[PDB]
Amino acid sequence: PQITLWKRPLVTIKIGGQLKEALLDTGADDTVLEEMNLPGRWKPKMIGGIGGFIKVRQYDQILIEICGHKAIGTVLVGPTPVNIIGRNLLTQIGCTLNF
């Protein structure tokens, strides 16, 4: 679809077999989701945002469906203010900015 930006670009995602709402975030390199249970192995990592750095659990090669488009990539889990879909997955679903 074509998404205008008068409202937050919030979409439904499916990850680990669960539905969630997430923000399509072109300013994020990486995808960061709020605390949740995910199967498989993870590794502790750090990520920085506008306010500083947080500790996250990095899950690699995770299947995630975004607004009906499939991606498989890295997902960071930690105390982010909101679920954000970053460019690592936005590229996989073919997302571009247009004006």
Added chain:
Amino acid sequence: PQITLWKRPLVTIKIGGQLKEALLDTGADDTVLEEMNLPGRWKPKMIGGIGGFIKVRQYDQILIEICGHKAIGTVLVGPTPVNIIGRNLLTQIGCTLNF
């Protein structure tokens, strides 16, 4: 134009008589610019993201040019690590997400 997301969507902007590089950021409600000494009145504000909150100065009705597209709206000035063009101005230049 059309901007793919393999790399950060950085564009040149013109604000307060200065040229700067800024992210086209669908994940930001507002526009947040690195510290600069703009004239006029402002209101204090706090905005939060990954890592917590930063203190910014809210200026209203600021003229900004984004890739030759003119806009006018609110800009928040503070210690952000990157210049962020948020949805309040992205709508004014006709920017959409497409996949």
